[PDB]
Structures are given as C-alpha cells and as structure tokens.
Amino acid sequence: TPEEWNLYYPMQLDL
Amino acid sequence: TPEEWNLYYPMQLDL
Amino acid sequence: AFAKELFLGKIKKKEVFPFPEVSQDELNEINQFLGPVEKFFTEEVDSRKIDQEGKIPDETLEKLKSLGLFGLQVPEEYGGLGFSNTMYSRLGEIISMDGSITVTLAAHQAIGLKGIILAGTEEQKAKYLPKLASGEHIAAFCLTEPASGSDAASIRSRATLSEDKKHYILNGSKVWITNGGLANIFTVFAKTEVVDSDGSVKDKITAFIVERDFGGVTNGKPEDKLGIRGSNTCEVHFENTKIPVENILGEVGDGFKVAMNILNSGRFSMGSVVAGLLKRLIEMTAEYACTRKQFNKRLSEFGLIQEKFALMAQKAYVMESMTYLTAGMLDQPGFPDCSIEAAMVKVFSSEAAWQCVSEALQILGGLGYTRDYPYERILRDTRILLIFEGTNEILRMYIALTGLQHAGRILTTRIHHGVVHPSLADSANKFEENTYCFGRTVETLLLRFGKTIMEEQLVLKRVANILINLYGMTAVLSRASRSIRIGLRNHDHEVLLANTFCVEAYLQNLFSLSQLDKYAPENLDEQIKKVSQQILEKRAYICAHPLDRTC
Amino acid sequence: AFAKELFLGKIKKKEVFPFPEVSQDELNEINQFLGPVEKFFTEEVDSRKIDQEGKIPDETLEKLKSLGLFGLQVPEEYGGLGFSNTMYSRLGEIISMDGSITVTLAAHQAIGLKGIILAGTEEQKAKYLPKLASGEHIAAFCLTEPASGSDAASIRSRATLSEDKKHYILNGSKVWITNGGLANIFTVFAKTEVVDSDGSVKDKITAFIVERDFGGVTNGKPEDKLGIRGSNTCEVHFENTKIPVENILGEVGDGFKVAMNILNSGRFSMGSVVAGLLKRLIEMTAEYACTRKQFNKRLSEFGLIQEKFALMAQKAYVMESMTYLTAGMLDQPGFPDCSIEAAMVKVFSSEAAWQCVSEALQILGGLGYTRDYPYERILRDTRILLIFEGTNEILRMYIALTGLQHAGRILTTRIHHGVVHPSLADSANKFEENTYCFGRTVETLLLRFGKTIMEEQLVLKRVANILINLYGMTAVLSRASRSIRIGLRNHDHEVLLANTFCVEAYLQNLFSLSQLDKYAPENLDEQIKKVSQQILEKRAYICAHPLDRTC
C-alpha cells in the first residue's frame, strides 16, 4: 500500500 | 367534536 | 377490505395473493401512451431550470396540456382519458422526473377535480370536466385554513344563504393550497347553517365549486418552499364570493362525505412515484460507484456501498409491490373501501424515499452535496413527501384507529397458505405467524384499553407499524410467486428481494409485538411521557451542563 | 485508552467513570470569556443573511477576529488563548449558531494551524502562529486530490528538491479545500523522493507550510454547496511553488504521521457543536408545539410529539456526555491515544443530528418546509455533518479496524460497577454484560476470520455500532452518577434519560451481537452481497415491472 490509504482506516492487519 | 376533525382520524370509537 | 380483517388475525386471500394481472391488449395501449410521454419527460423537461427559477415554463406546461396529462383519470366521455388506477400508477413513475410537475399534476387530478368526479352531478360534470381535463382550467382543493389563535383542524369558513335563496355568499380563507395562483376551479369546504325539524342552529360542512370568475377570490404571493420550487402554493381568501346554489357538491350539509372521499381515495400511486425515482438513483449512483477508484478498488466492491444498493433495491421492490397490489384492489367492479392500504403505501413510500435519497447522496460523498449534481435537488424535493397528502404521524392514527373500529364492532358482536410458491415457504410461515400474533395482540389491546385507546398514541404507532409491515410482507409474496409461476426474467432476484425483506420485517414485528404487553420490561412509554412532559412544561432542555458544579 | 480495551471485554473503570470535573476558577474564566461571544452570536450574527448571500460579511469576520475565536487553542505564548479541550467544546456550542462559521473556524483551528502546533518547530511556531491566531492569516488543510481516472485516496502531488538544495518545487492540485479562497497558509502533503542506503527511489509523504506569497498558488471559484453557503470551499492548485526547505513540518518523509495526528485530533468536539444545536431545536419547537392548538388540544399533549421531544433530549444528553467525556480524557497530562472515541462521537453526533433535525422539521408540518423559518436552513446545514471531517462509513471501518488490531496483538501475545449510583443499577449490569459479550464475540471473530476481517465490511459495521453504543452507555452512566452524587438541579431527568438510552442501546447491542455468529439466521449478508453484486454488474434495477407479461 502507498502508506497513504492508512489515513482513512488501517490496512494490512498484522495478525 | 366537530365533524371535520374526523377527516384526520376517527375521534370517537363506537365501543 | 384486506387490511381491516388483519386486525382479526385472519388472512383474506383470493383478493391479495393472486397478483393483479393486466390483459395483453391493455398493456400495449399504455406502452403506446408512455412512448411520447417518456420521450417528452426525458428530453424536453429541464428539472434544474425549473428548480432554480421557481416557475414551470409556459412552453412545458402547454406541451403537458397537449399530452392530456391533466385529465388522466377523467372519464373519456368528458374529454379525459379514463385511465384505471394501475394505468395511472404506471404513469406516475415517469412523471416524477421533475418533482415540481408530479405535485402540480397530482394536486389537480388526485384532489383537484376528483370532487366533481366523485360527487358532482351529471350536469356539473358536463360543464367543468371537459375544460378541466383539456388543461384550460386548473382545479385546487381548499380544505385547511390558517390557525391563528384557533384550532388547526376546525373550519371557520362561512357560507350564508342569501335573502332571495338564489346563491350562497362565502367568506373565509385557506392556506397551503397547491395551484392557488393557477387554479380557476376551487373545491371549497365551508360550514353552512342547516335548520331541521328540531329547529336547532346546527351547522354542517358543505363542498362548493367556486370559480375565480365569481369575484371576491384573491390569492397572495407564492410561498418559498424548500424543495418543490416549481409548484405554486399560495393562500386563497374568499371575500363575499357569490356561489350559485347549483354549484354544490352532492347535497347541502353533506360535505364531510365528499371531503372524506377525495382525501382517502388517493396516495397509492405515490408508492410507485417514489419507486420510479428510487430506480433512477440506482441507475445514477451505480454509474458513479463503478467508474470510481478507491484503495485500488471499485466503489462497488466495498460492502458498505453494496448494502446501500441492496437496501435501495429492496425498498423499491416493496414499494412497487404495495402500489400495484393496492391499485389492483381499487380496479375491482363496484366501489371497494381500500383507504388503510393507501395510507400504508404513503407512509412506507415517504419513509423509504427520505432514507434512500439521503443514503444515495451519501454514496457520492462531497460531490453530491453541491448544486451541480442531481442529488441536492432530489434531496430537497423528497422532504415534502412526508408532509404532502397528509403528515406521516397523522396517518398512523388513521391506519390504527380505522382498523380498530372494524375489530371493535366484530369483538362486541362476537361477545354479545398453498398460494405462495414452495420456494417462498420460509417467508409465508412468518407472515401467518405475525398475522395471528397481531390479531391476538389487537384483541388484547381492545380488551385492556377500549374507548380510551385514543389517548395512547404510542400504542397506535406500534399497531400502525406492524400492520404496515404485514402489508409489505404480502405484496412481495404475491409478486414474487407470480414471477416464479409465469417465469419472468431474473425472477431469482425477485425471490432474493422478497425473502430478504420478509425476514427483516418479521424481526421488526416480533420486536414491536413484545412491547404491546402489560409485563414488557423493554417498553419505554411511561418514561417517555415523564421526560417529554417535563421538557414541555419547561419548554426547554432541562439537564444542566456537564461542567456545572454546585456548592 | 478505553475503547481499545473495550475490545478485550475489560472495562477500565479508572479513566471514564469519575466524570471530568472542572475547578471553580476555570469555570469562572470560561464564563467570563462567554458573554461578549454569546451575545455577539445571538444578536450581531445574521444566519439568514449569510445563508442567502453566500458570503460572511466582513464586519462579522472582523468582530470574530477581534474576539479571538481564530486562536482558541493556540498557546498563549503565540498570541492565542490556550483553551483546553473541555473549554473548546464549551465554545463550540455557542459557535454552532451559524453553521457557516462553525465550519470556517473549525477548518482553520482543528485541521488548519493544528499542524504547526503539533509538528512545527519552535522557530516555525514563532513565525506563523502569532499571525494565524490574530486572524490576519487563515490556515487550510490540503490533503485530497481530484480523482480523475485514478485512485481517490493516493497522493499524486509531487515535490522535487532543487538543484542547489535550497527549496523544494511543488506541483499538484487539491480539491474540497475549506477556506481555499481565504487561507494564506496551506498545510500541503506531497510525495517526495527519498534516497537511502538501499539506493531505491522510494517516495514518502511530506507536509509543507505553503504560503500564498510563495507564488504559483491558484484556486478556482467556490463550490455551490447545499447548506453551508457562507463557507469558502475551493480547489487549490500549486504550479511550481517554491517552498523553502525550512518550511517542512517535522522531517522529510514524516508527513503521514503529521496527517494522522491532525485528522485524529479534531473530531471530539462535534458532539457538543450539535448538542448545542439540538438544544436550540427543543426550545423553538417546544414554543411552537405549546402555543398551537389541534383537535382542541395542545400539540404538546399528543404522544407522537412527546416521543419526538424525548428522543431529541435523549440524543442531546448522550452527545454532551460523549463529548465532555472524550474532552476530559484528552486533557490528561501526556498524550493519550483517544482517536477511536473521537470517531465515535463524530458518527453518533452526525447520525443524531440528521435524524433529530429532520424530525423537528416534521413537527412543524408544512410551516417548517418554507424558507421563512429557521428549520429549512438548519436542515440543509446538518447534512454536511455526515461528510465533513471524515465520512461516516469510513469512520466505522476506522474504529473497528483500529480496535481489532489491538485485540489481535493482545490475543497473539496471549496465545504464543461500584462507581455508578445504586439507582443506576439496572443499567450498569446491562453495560457489563454487553461489554463481556462484545469481548467474546470479538475474540471469536478474530479467531474465525483473521486477516480476512479486513474485507468483511458488514461485520466491522456491526462491531463499530456496538462499540459506539457501549461508549454512549458508559458516558451517560458516568454523567448521571456524577449528577446524583453532587446533587445537581434536575438530576432525576438525567437519570430517566440515562436509563432510557441504556435500555435502548442494550437491546440494539443484543440484536447486533446475535447477528455476529456463524449460525445466526437473522444475519442477512450472504443475501445482500448477491443482490448488490447483480445490481452493480447490471448497473441498474433488475426486477421487471409488476405489469410485465411472458408468453
């Protein structure tokens, strides 16, 4: 991810 | 009660 | 009817479940008529121009008059078209493109000239209907009057019979009159004195056919409404208007019956009207939700937009089913009394309109909040739908109390599903169970309260809601079963949209039927009365600020 | 925090239950600051004029600058006032009397100069803050770009470092920028290339402080918004803007952190902005309903208006509780990560605003649909609240995913009510049971779905709804317990409102948690997906007309 979409909501959950 | 009020909904029940 | 027997816990089939079928010959005629009308409405109607200017262009109004859309349901013998109720609901979907025309036309057809049709004599119809249907004259319905230090529902309009007994003299004023600035024929209701063998001074409501040529009729400037700017809503005052005695609808004193007949016989097409709008939204927002990228994905690929689209489709399906089911029961030979179903359709249609329109505007985000898109205008236009043709909370009492009249007479007198397709079997059992529970609960409510049920308007709101859901749970089981039986295109979508609504409505009715019991701990009706009573006796918010601190 | 550990089924009854208390001196100071502000907003501010003209008068803006409302939270050392988070929410209620000013001010304070405060150096603050707080300069937040054939969330803005290494050159364009035509200081985020030991061409987001005096900054005409017509929402274009290297917020490449901080810092105060507007509706509408007659009765004496007033009051109470609880948790020493609670407050406040405003407008009937009453304007103004400061469906995903990430860390690491008053005992047990059930359900969801939970947007919506309801319950319980303990005036009304909301929220959460199971027949999400997928692949309504026939 462009580490910009994470502003809207977190992405690529590290579980 | 005035009759025109029954134009909205029945004011009196026949019970 | 059908809804009045739902209060008794019985499902009246052979009237609802075989869905109204239209003959092949009739469908071709309506398609041939819709052709030019749809072509005109899609191309030559500028909704944005009408909304921004607040006036319907004269060319558009004249071209509408050419189409004969001002005399849709007027009998063919009087210069009209004589369309049935189903054939009128069909036209209501393609007319709703503007919103300011679906209000001008409905207020002239549904309530405007409907009085002359229902109660006018054969000589009154031969004088007013040929020119009302041709569009030369426009009709208005004058019932409500402005409450200033007086009751909002009482009629203070007066009609005094003259000394020579040749014409009445009318004095009064009316408010919220649609087409007030355009109408040439007014259906005015006024209280006139009646003397009988008793020798009393009892006055009764009487309906008149008041022409603007009678003199003494004056209307003010049009009101600055939020959404429907093209409509002409004025207030009309009659100052010593001389109405000939022959211009009386029905009989003197018998004006309440006419006013009840005009208002009740309508609103059903609204459910189709809004449906014809809702589908349009699905045809616009999808074109935006499939050509736009977010997070390297379509907007259509996100669950929170898919839920919106599915909700809109389910609402439109239930609305269309309700409207055509109601219009099919109004086309039966004779004069059927289906007025609860029309109020049901109006309430459901208005609520779904507001919710779905707001949610569609939410789909586009900040682009739909501007005046450059056709969602701002639609958002403002569909808000009147909860006030037009009757306030939604007034009609819930009408729905609940009219049916409790029917149950009351039967109860006092008594004291003193192999039609739905097998695939739709999980939803018919829920419908039967909910109907039986509703009948039992209505009997219990009548036993507990009785004539005091007028005061409990929170009990009647839950009764009016369970019954509204019960009508949508049988309109979508009749339509989907017919689709399966005939084998229409993509009937699996219809089955999916019918089984999805039935489950949700069954859950809603199951919740509401639990709150109509004496021992319900989840019933917040006593606590709402106290809080609201305190607020209204203080006429302001009561709770102190969270930062307040006492000694 | 509190919400993050709500996902684990644990109630942290140490930060939330003793309600934030404000000492007497601070209350006197805030009341002294009030007065000259409340009187100005009630008397010298013409909301109707601002809405109809579409431009805030220069005298009003000059007086707003004089009052110091442009530097409310700027530290006192930089020409501001240094107000805390519970003293800014207090002023939000007074500011909310316009809609076009509560948006201009918030976009300059919450998302404007907030970047310089959070990440600016001591020499940048000494240069921009004294003139940003004085009102001479206005700040804007430039993050999003117009999606035209590209993703709607990614950044295409470019900042190229010059040959002489003395200033960056910025090229890009931003859309939906509030105060675009008024701002002189822009907080622009652009992707700039960073070279490291790896020798790659990896680019990172970097925040700049772009002045309009830098040259190459141009903006278009303002948007034609529905409700907030006094605001100035333009799109700003940067064409070869020369930004000195010293005008970088923090460090190069550290723009995502700054953007996250600014976005998450400024959402808690919306609940008091609207609760201060809901309380204004309960005052005018109460006057109308108590001074009007219908059926020889007050409008206040009808149950269906009492329910509306009670719902409005309950919404306002819960909103104020949420806002002041969040602002009290944000006033603790250090830096708490209470970003989920701000999104909760925003979502609940926007939903309650829309519902209550529409319902209050419905109370007045057809009189509230005209432009001569202050309900049309309020109805249009509160629609942006579901879009302004994050869309409501984005924030539900934010809440759910931010909580589930923390829950996932805790579960992976593990694997590898005596504060409430005894009168509030029936509502604390419900809150505890719902919290325990929510923790169990979240654990089950994390076990079953894992990383797939990212795609399921209908499960996350239910999780967010349950968490929002839990936050509302705990906020109202804390406020009611404090009111009983201290003994404020009219605390029985507070107890009634708290108990009613707790019962309603408990029922809603019970349903939602019932719908979050593998074997739940009430769950309609495998059927919604099919219907929505069919609709979106056809891009139109699928079901045939009820009058359709097949041979």
Author numbering:
A (entry chain D), B (entry chain C): 320 to 334
C (entry chain B), D (entry chain A): 38 to 453, 487 to 621
Paper quotes:
The Mitochondrial Complex I Assembly (MCIA) complex is essential for the biogenesis of respiratory Complex I (CI), the first enzyme in the respiratory chain, which has been linked to Alzheimer’s disease (AD) pathogenesis. The inclusion of an additional N-terminal 26 residues in the ECSIT construct (hereafter named ECSITCTER, residues 221–431), combined with optimisation of the purification and subcomplex reconstitution protocols led to a 3.0 Å resolution cryo-EM structure of the ACAD9WT-ECSITCTER complex, enabling us to build and refine an atomic model that includes nearly all ACAD9 residues as well as a 15-residue peptide spanning ECSIT residues 320–334. As previously described, ACAD9 is present as a dimer, where the C-terminal regions (residues 600–621) form helix loops that are positioned around the neighbouring protomer thereby stabilising the active dimer.
Specifically, ECSIT Glu323 makes a salt bridge with ACAD9 Lys228, stabilising the ECSIT binding on the N-terminal segment with the ACAD9 β4 strand, whereas a second salt bridge between ECSIT Asp333 and ACAD9 Arg446 stabilises the ECSIT binding on the C-terminal end with the ACAD9 α16 helix. Furthermore, ECSIT directly interacts with the ACAD9 β1–β2 loop through three hydrogen bonds between ECSIT Trp324 and ACAD9 Ser191 and Asp188, respectively, and ECSIT Glu323 with the backbone amide of Ile192. Examination of the electrostatics properties of the binding interface shows that the surface of the ACAD9 is mainly positively charged whereas the modelled ECSIT sequence is mostly negative. Thr320 forms hydrogen bonds with Gln331, stabilising the helical sequence that enters into the ACAD9 binding cavity.
